[PDB]
């Protein structure tokens with residue numbers, strides 16, 4: 001689809017069998033979701049934002065369906081203010097900016 | 100044009116008579132620019148993201164040219180790590196997400 005930006009580009013995602021709402025975020029290199037339970041191994045990681053760094057749990061090769069488009073990639077889980085879908089997955093679903 | 104997301108979507112902007120590099124950021128409601136001494140009145144503001152909040156100065160009705168497309172709106176000036184072009188300006192240049 002074509003998504004305008006007059007409102008936040010929020011979409012429904014399916015991850016670990018659960019539906020959530022997430023923001024399509026071209027300013028984010030990586031994908032960061034709010035605290036949740038995901039199966040499998042994970043490694044601690046640090047990521048920095050506008051206000052500083054947070055500790056996240058890094059889950060690799062995680063299946064995630066974004067607005068009906070499948071992706072399999074890295075998902076960071078931690079105290080982000082909102083679920084954000086970053087470029088690592090936006091590229092997988094073929095998302096581009098156009099003007 | 101069309102901008103893929105393999106790399107950060109960095110473009111040249113023109114503001115206050117200066118050229119700068121900025122990030123087209125669909126995850127940002129508003130626009131946040133590096134420290135610059137713009138003329139005119141302003142009001143203090145707090146903006147938050149990953150890692151907490153930072154103090155910024157809010158200037159209104161600022162003209163920015165983004166890839167030759169002009170836009171006029173609010174700009175937040177402060178110690179941001181990157182120049183962030185938010186939806187308030189992206190909408191004015193007709194920017195959309197597409198997949």
Ligand SMILES: CCOP(=O)(COc1ccc(C[C@H](NC(=O)O[C@H]2CO[C@H]3OCC[C@H]32)[C@H](O)CN(C[C@@H](C)CC)S(=O)(=O)c2ccc([C@H](C)O)cc2)cc1)OCC
Nearest residue numbers: 027028029030048049050126127128129146147148149180
């Ligand atoms: C060399 C130093 O750089 P640095 O590492 C940080 O650099 C960066 C800092 C910020 C960004 C943009 C930010 N992306 C981001 O957080 O991405 C994280 C996850 O993926 C990684 O990729 C890049 C960083 C990591 C997002 O797109 C937009 N945000 C809102 C989003 C969280 C939804 C609520 S916002 O910025 O907070 C914001 C809030 C309010 C407004 C106005 C008021 O409406 C405007 C902007 C990109 C690079 O320093 C470490 C301290």
